[PDB]
Amino acid sequence: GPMQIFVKTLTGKTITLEVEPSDTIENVKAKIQDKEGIPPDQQRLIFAGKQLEDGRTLSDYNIQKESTLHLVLRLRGX
Amino acid sequence: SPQSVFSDSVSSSRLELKKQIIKALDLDYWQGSGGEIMPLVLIDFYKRHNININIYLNHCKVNNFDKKAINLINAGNHYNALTMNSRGNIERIDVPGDGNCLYHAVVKSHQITRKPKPYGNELQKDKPEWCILKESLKTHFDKDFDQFVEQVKCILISENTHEANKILDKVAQYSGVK
């Protein structure tokens, strides 16, 4: 059953995604690219104090409907 | 003679803990977590003065320019400025490749379009514009620290180092984890 989650960057930009518990982290990164244009290899996601890894699913982290993930980009330069 | 009446906005030991955290993050070292913090503080300070900042990463398509914003490019661990030429061009303006390229790029972008400046005064006319901006941003981070704590946590988690994990313990104590 598809569920709604939010993805918020550290500047506060929030987007809505619809996902399945069985979707991989790298699939979630593809959906973020479809909406914000950020390539998956520039993306780092955080939830409940943990960095989400490629090769795992959302369900592994007990991510629930209306959960918020944090999107970290590398902005340093210089 | 002694103080009978009290109101306090903050604790003394809590302020010291915040000062120790800011020092460990080392905002003058752009290669570590301080270099992720200063661009977020820049965007927020400019927003609070009703000016938009836009940052472009590497070679990107650049679908719609907003000429009324401060536009910056970060490709290759270096900040330069962006502007429009010859009725549609997009050009990159180089700035020195020292550790202060972020603040030079913002000053250079104000100079090329005469876009309004949210920093500085006549008391600092002996001081370079890029210095006034950088110090205004460190002051802002210090005074609105509580508004950046969640971002600071995520930056430290994502760095994945012993150095960042020890700072993250001090942030968790500050946020009240027990």
Numbering used by the authors:
A (entry chain B): -1 to 76
B (entry chain A): 185 to 362
Task: Cite, word for word, the article reporting this structure.
The ovarian tumor (OTU) family of deubiquitinases regulates diverse ubiquitin signals in humans. We have predicted and validated a set of OTU deubiquitinases encoded by several classes of pathogenic bacteria.
A crystal structure of a covalent EschOTU‐Ub complex was determined to 2.1 Å resolution by molecular replacement with Ub and a sieved model of the OTU domain generated using MUSTANG (Konagurthu et al, 2010; Figs 4A and D, and EV4A, Table 1). The structure confirms our predicted and tested active site residues as well as the overall OTU domain architecture. Like wMelOTU, the EschOTU OTU domain is a pared‐down version that aligns well with OTUB1 and vOTU through the central β‐sheet and supporting α‐helices (0.6 and 0.5 Å RMSD, respectively), but lacks α‐helices above the sheet that would form the canonical sandwich structure. The Ub‐binding S1 site is comprised almost entirely of a primary interaction between a helical arm region and the I44 hydrophobic patch of Ub, and makes very few contacts through what is normally a secondary interaction site in other OTUs. A small secondary interaction site is formed between L241 in the edge strand of the EschOTU central β‐sheet and the Ub I36 hydrophobic patch.
